[PDB]
């Protein structure tokens, strides 16, 4: 239902190890599709999704060009920021920029973003109205004043409401079979003897797409009473995800515990139990 | 008068060609030479005052003299502000930023018509 | 032959207004200098205007919510325009609708004889 186009840009300064490292990563609906790294063999905008390869050299040229200007400007911005904060050049400093589109099932803009952080702390951000900025300190107030003088908020709002929305639609159709696909989770239950009278029952959910999932354990057909151990959803590295939920059950009580897998890629939810060999 | 040829931009009785195309430093100065112009030498603070809002970087007529061991303009002149590697060539942003880069890297450029 | 402080492109003079004005005041200010508020003829001109990388009120306007964008003199160029936001402005991302009452800079096209 909700759709998004986002760019995560990072410029991380080098302590004498040459120029700062410059990275741009493009995400369509929380999945990476393009990348720019100044540390790669020949810096250019590279495809990170098979469906974006459908773009001609005209697209890649335009984006490689935008990225090379961005890096130069982020380098200059790092040198300005060092002077503002009276910091030594001999240390690792980082400038981050996140901007993008949020559209609903209705192909219109819900919210636009344009925010920056210096050394992990918010610096300057565009308001929901997309007409004014929020500074955080003296340095960012100077940068707000500089942005105002070049009508940056209006420029960013123009991109956020226009090209960002329009391009997101192009990407959504370009990789529909992938973006809106449903990889059902492959679930199983492992048995781990934890104590002399206790056991860990781990319910795995593997190879699922999208990342949204609900894993829950039920004792005799009723929700958890004890503390349930659960890992933060992790990528398998192939496009699919992994997650597991575990419970410390008494020995001989394995059958009185049932696992429930809740994922959109499943017509009916999965009911799992530990299967002991005869 | 002070008019310019088709696709050129006139300002302060100077004719400028702002490239759409990306070219190497050598090929860019070779394109400027043919149009009886040269790469821009922005020794003046706000040479591209009309371009002041632009964040885009363009090749400029700057060369490192390995004999004098310092940066020099195509003119032979010595600059003074905004600057490092001798093997690199210089790009300039109308917003007054300066950046060094590989001379074999492709970039946009600005030709300034000679009298 | 344009004044020294101004821009000369394809036999037309261009200057930025000293202040950020409303759509009406921006149209009024250009007329007062024997020029017109920015109008787009070709993509080559639009791309050159996008090179300047400025926010500028454009001549293109609409009378209301359902009324169409108005521009004349048989120039086919009608770019994509992205409420009370009934006036079109030019940016680095192309033409964008905005509230006429909001103050933005403006560029005048003069075209001396």
């Amino acid at each position: 239902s909700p759709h998004s186009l986002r760019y995560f840009t990072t410029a991380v300064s080098r302590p004498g190890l040459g120029e700062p490292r410059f990275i741009i990563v493009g995400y369509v609906d929380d999945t990476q599709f393009v990348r720019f790294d100044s540390d790669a063999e020949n810096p250019r905008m590279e495809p990170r999704a098979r469906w974006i390869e459908q773009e001609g050299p005209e697209y890649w040229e335009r984006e490689t060009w935008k990225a090379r200007d961005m890096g130069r400007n982020f380098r200059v911005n790092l040198r300005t920021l060092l002077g503002y904060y009276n910091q030594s050049n001999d240390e690792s400093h980082t400038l981050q920029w996140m901007y993008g589109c949020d559209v609903g099932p209705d192909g219109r803009l819900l919210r636009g973003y344009c925010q920056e952080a210096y050394d992990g702390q918010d610096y300057i951000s565009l308001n929901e109205d997309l007409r004014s900025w929020t500074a955080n300190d003296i340095a960012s107030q100077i940068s707000k004043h500089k942005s105002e003088a070049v009508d940056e908020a209006h420029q960013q709002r123009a991109y956020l409401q226009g090209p960002c929305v329009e391009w997101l639609h192009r990407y959504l159709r370009l990789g529909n079979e992938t973006l809106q696909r449903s990889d059902p989770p492959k679930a199983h239950v492992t048995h781990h003897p934890r104590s002399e009278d206790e056991v860990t029952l781990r319910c795995w959910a593997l190879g699922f797409y999208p990342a949204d999932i609900t894993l829950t354990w039920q004792l005799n057909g009723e929700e958890l009473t004890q503390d349930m151990e659960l890992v933060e959803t992790r990528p398998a590295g192939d496009g699919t995800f992994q997650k597991w939920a575990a419970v410390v059950v008494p020995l001989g009580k394995e059958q009185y515990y049932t696992c429930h897998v809740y994922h959109e890629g499943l017509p009916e939810p999965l009911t799992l139990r530990w299967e002991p060999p005869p | 008068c002070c008019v310019c040829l088709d696709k050129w931009v006139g300002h302060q009785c100077n004719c400028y060609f702002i490239s759409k195309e990306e070219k190497s430093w050598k090929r860019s100065r070779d394109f400027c030479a043919s149009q009886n112009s040269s790469l821009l030498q922005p020794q003046s603070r706000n040479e591209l005052s009309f371009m002041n809002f632009s964040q885009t970087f363009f090749w400029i007529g700057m060369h490192y003299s390995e004999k004098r061991n310092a940066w020099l303009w195509e003119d032979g002149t010595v600059p003074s502000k905004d600057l490092i590697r001798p093997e690199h060539c210089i790009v300039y942003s109308p917003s007054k930023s300066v950046s060094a880069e590989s001379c074999e890297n492709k970039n946009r450029y600005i030709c300034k018509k000679l009298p | 032959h344009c004044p020294k402080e101004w821009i000369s492109y394809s036999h037309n003079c261009y200057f930025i207004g000293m202040e950020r004005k409303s759509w009406n005041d921006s149209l009024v200010s250009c007329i007062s200098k024997n020029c017109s508020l920015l109008y787009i003829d070709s993509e080559e001109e639009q791309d050159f205007l996008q090179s300047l990388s400025l926010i500028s009120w454009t001549g293109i306007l609409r009378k209301g919510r359902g009324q169409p964008w108005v521009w004349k003199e048989d120039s086919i160029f009608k770019p994509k325009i992205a409420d009370e936001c009934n006036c079109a402005m030019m940016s680095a991302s192309g033409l964008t609708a905005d509230n006429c009452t909001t103050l933005h800079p403006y560029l005048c096209k003069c075209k001396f004889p």
């Binding site: 760019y7 840009t9 741009i24 493009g26 697209y59 335009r62 984006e63 935008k66 990225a67 961005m70 400007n73 982020f74 200059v76 911005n77 300005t80 920021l81 920029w97 901007y99 344009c114 920056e116 610096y123 300057i124 340095a139 940068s143 500089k146 942005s147 070049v150 940056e152 420029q155 960013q156 991109y159 090209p163 960002c164 391009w167 | 964040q55 917003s95 | 996008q50 990388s53 680095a92 991302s93």
Partner: peptide, 9 residues
């Protein structure tokens, strides 16, 4: 596609 501009701090 990416934004044509960034913030000049």
């Amino acid at each position: 596609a990416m934004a044509p501009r960034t913030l000049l701090l």
